[PDB]
Design an enzyme around this catalytic site. Sequence first.
Site, mmCIF file in Angstrom:
data_model
loop_
_atom_site.group_PDB
_atom_site.id
_atom_site.type_symbol
_atom_site.label_atom_id
_atom_site.label_comp_id
_atom_site.label_asym_id
_atom_site.label_seq_id
_atom_site.Cartn_x
_atom_site.Cartn_y
_atom_site.Cartn_z
ATOM 1 N N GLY A 11 0.787 -1.059 -0.117
ATOM 2 C CA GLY A 11 -0.049 -0.065 0.091
ATOM 3 C C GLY A 11 0.859 1.342 0.212
ATOM 4 O O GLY A 11 2.053 1.319 -0.264
ATOM 5 N N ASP A 123 -2.369 9.540 15.488
ATOM 6 C CA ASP A 123 -2.934 9.404 14.168
ATOM 7 C C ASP A 123 -3.510 7.993 13.922
ATOM 8 O O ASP A 123 -3.265 7.196 12.702
ATOM 9 C CB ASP A 123 -1.926 9.695 12.843
ATOM 10 C CG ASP A 123 -2.876 9.792 11.531
ATOM 11 O OD1 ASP A 123 -4.171 10.147 11.551
ATOM 12 O OD2 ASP A 123 -2.391 9.686 10.380
ATOM 13 N N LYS A 125 -6.103 5.114 12.870
ATOM 14 C CA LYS A 125 -7.287 4.933 12.187
ATOM 15 C C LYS A 125 -7.170 3.415 11.667
ATOM 16 O O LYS A 125 -6.287 2.802 11.895
ATOM 17 C CB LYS A 125 -7.096 5.768 10.801
ATOM 18 C CG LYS A 125 -5.785 5.183 10.041
ATOM 19 C CD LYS A 125 -5.374 6.088 8.935
ATOM 20 C CE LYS A 125 -4.397 7.299 9.612
ATOM 21 N NZ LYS A 125 -3.839 8.290 8.397
#
Length: 294
Positions: A11, A123, A125
Amino acid sequence: MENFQKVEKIGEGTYGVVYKARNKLTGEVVALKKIRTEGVPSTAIREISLLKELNHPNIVKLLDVIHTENKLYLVFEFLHQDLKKFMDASALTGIPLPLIKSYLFQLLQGLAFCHSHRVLHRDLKPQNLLINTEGAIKLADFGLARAFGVPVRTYTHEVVTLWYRAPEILLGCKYYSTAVDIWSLGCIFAEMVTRRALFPGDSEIDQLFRIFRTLGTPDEVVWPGVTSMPDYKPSFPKWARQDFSKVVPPLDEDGRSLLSQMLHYDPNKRISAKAALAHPFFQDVTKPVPHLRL
Ligand SMILES: CCC[C@@H]1CCc2[nH]nc(C(=O)NN)c2C1
């Protein structure tokens, strides 16, 4: 890297591309992240290198850090899927509550550990929560925000999501406390239960106003000092707080209670990871295995 046959591109992260690779010497399969450049602050290298000792079963292991030829490689343990992909795959039927509970329980353990070592993620997520076939879930990219900051766009110019961002960050706080991670996890918990993002903001003000519309516009009553925050504006609309029964149906009262404590506006009041582990919601926690088609 010269001693890494790169199986595939897994990714694109916030900072760099991620490849699945096989170490030719140990034969181990790892997730290799390649990052950027004016020489790259060595301050970051020291900080990142310290993460090699931040080891825990619910934290993706950082195997190595290599700074070479204007690039920074982070070698990580490899897991087969991230929670975003799992939630999408589980969209039609939903993730069973027992597995949701197990995942939250494990994520809180990972947070309790890092936080006890004074390391924040900043961060969190779904995209950086990784799962395996054993029923485990691990937090990835911990500590990278302290080193590089969280940019508005990724290295590919993709918008970094605001959906899990705590309100104190949106209001301009200079100092981030461990509470910012509890907020993000709470938003993720809600998303697993409802199969829809809790606060899908598409700008900083839309993110802030979505939070306000559900939790009520914060005031000095629930959040001492909020009106003195850098980006607080007296002109913010004043929305009334909604009942959690409407927000995360059909989660039971123990889960609603825990989520409400994870989403308190006041960072100083927001439940800690350690205290959350002792919440009655986890009284019957188990470790189910997900159905993963790899
Ligand atoms: C959050 C993106 C960076 C992660 C670092 C550790 C890591 N380990 N496995 C993966 C993966 O994508 N497997 N499919 C990642 C990606």
